Amino acid sequence: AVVQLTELGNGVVQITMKDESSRNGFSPSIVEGLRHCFSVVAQNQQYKVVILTGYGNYFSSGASKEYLIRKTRGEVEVLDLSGLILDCEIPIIAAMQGHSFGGGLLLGLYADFVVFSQESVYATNFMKYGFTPVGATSLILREKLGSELAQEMIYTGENYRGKELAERGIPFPVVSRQDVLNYAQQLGQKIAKSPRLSLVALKQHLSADIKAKFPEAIKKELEIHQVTFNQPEIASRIQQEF
Amino acid sequence: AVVQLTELGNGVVQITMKDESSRNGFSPSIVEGLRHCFSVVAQNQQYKVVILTGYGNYFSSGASKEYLIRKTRGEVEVLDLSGLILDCEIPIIAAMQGHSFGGGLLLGLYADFVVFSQESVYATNFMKYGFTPVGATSLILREKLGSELAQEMIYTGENYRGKELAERGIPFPVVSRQDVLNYAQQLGQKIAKSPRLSLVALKQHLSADIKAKFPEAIKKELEIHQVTFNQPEIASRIQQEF
Amino acid sequence: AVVQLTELGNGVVQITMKDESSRNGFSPSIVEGLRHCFSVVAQNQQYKVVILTGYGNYFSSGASKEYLIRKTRGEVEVLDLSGLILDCEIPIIAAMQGHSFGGGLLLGLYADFVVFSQESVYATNFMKYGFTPVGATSLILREKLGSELAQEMIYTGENYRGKELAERGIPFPVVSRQDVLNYAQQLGQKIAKSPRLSLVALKQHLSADIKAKFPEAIKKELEIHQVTFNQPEIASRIQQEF
């Protein structure tokens, strides 16, 4: 119920994340709804484009600070949602009409096209808490945003408004929040003019370089994360971010 | 006669494409003239820079729609003009004073330096007709234009004015059509100040990464093109583009 | 004495190059001071960030023309200062408050973060004299500046003001000379908020791709440099640059 799939016509579908209690964080119901909605897409051979979007002021909050505290005590797994986006056969547009944090930003950046909101806040959060990324952050961020913006965003963990990112020349559209989904929907109908077979073939071809590097990047980042996350001072740093 | 080589001084030469009947498309006379002019360059050890340019409102139209229709019926080969640019020992400047479409855009983007016209139209056409690129489009476009502009241009097949491309921050000069060739000629004399041996050595060095990936990229794209081009609905899509 | 290390607080240190006789060129005292100051950093496990900076109107002049003349006669080694920057365990910010030429520009571009001065002049000098780069120039410049700016800067050897580079959209900050060091110092304190272990781990991770390509790039460029540098006309070209 927190993640709904709706048909927009011409094989364009929308996956909408709405879990207001967690602010579209990676809650159990969000992860279940995403896996369900994307498996529905996988069974359907008529769909051509997916637009992934959130609700209100939120695209995706990623892992909560509560989750991170549970993790310092080894009570919870590392979540890897990359497969859902990466193994989807058809192009995905991430319409990030609201804020995206940590794994929430990665969730959008794994997509084939990304639309930012001008007013919203975007962050690879990890180093805000003093530890290194997971989810092949380095690979995807350097590929999509360029190495210098990626490097600064990764080292600092700091928050960037959509408009600040445009001003530093990211290749993605950065429009007003009320325009984000509409824009994605227009781009979606544009792409969906093509035969589905060509869209599937093209996506596989264009993704091959990143796809080939991904398993190793994921494993390497995790090795480093497990070391840096599990240092004594980390729990207290997380606490100071509440 | 449709492709002429002229000496500009200081080892800078110009290859001018003028086939008005086909609009500088890949006509038999254009392909013959290009192969001839570039083999002339290959024999000459005095030349330092080539400026490749078209006529009037056209740099290069690539394969005609008529050619594509002949191709749906297996009457014509896939044209691969990459060798002519890629195997040239000396730097080439593509002065694209007019429109460049499909293989015509690639023809310019294979060059070491590229100059765009503000008013002209630029497209990787393939997906306009519903099928995937040939000629290592993905490789070259992502390398020269960045992955996000490349991806959008490849998925859509749509037409972009020089000025629209500058506004989205491509690293190439985008000047008025009447300025394109002059600009290329000035850059050409600048480069030609260097010893020819250093120019040849530097070009080989800077090209090595792309050169190493190229045969595989070419083969892979062709494999996919042969599948997507030869689907039943394609002939009719081409027909609707006349 | 020409290179001094000073502590700025919170594990941020500054390495200041001041050899006014050579204009911060790669003089014996500059190379000795750099090696000393960086080995001091290597022994200290408390430091988190280094800011590398020059004096007055100069960051680094690289190899003098006098040195190059000695080199045409085989009297001097090729200098490779890359190790000092590349083997430093902690992030380095190159605050290039003044001009940087040839190996002097590379010295800064090897760093994890780079700040340019608006008014200063920046050049990969090699081809100004008619010969090819050393120090993995192609690798680092294409990675940090993008292939098209890198290519033009490498082919021409020409001089670019900080402000000209910003106008062509380099991802680095380009601020007034009086602001360069302050800016670097602020960025330095920002980064130094993180645990040193995470900073060391992250730097290694983010550097791995370039680090893996570097020995081969260095060797390949040197092979080509040794050919192009040692051609008969080169000594006279250097002479005309005095």
CSV table of C-alpha atoms in Angstrom, one decimal, chain A residues 31 35 63 67 70-71 74-81 222 226:
chain,number,residue,atom,x,y,z
A,31,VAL,CA,11.4,-2.4,0.7
A,35,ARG,CA,10.3,-5.4,-4.5
A,63,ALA,CA,18.3,4.1,6.2
A,67,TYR,CA,18.4,1.6,11.8
A,70,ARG,CA,20.6,-1.1,15.4
A,71,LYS,CA,23.4,-1.7,13.0
A,74,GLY,CA,24.7,-6.0,14.7
A,75,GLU,CA,20.9,-6.3,14.9
A,76,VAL,CA,20.2,-5.6,11.2
A,77,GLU,CA,21.5,-6.5,7.8
A,78,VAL,CA,23.1,-4.1,5.3
A,79,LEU,CA,20.3,-3.2,2.8
A,80,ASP,CA,21.2,-3.5,-0.9
A,81,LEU,CA,18.3,-2.2,-3.1
A,222,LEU,CA,31.3,-3.0,1.8
A,226,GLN,CA,32.5,-2.7,7.6
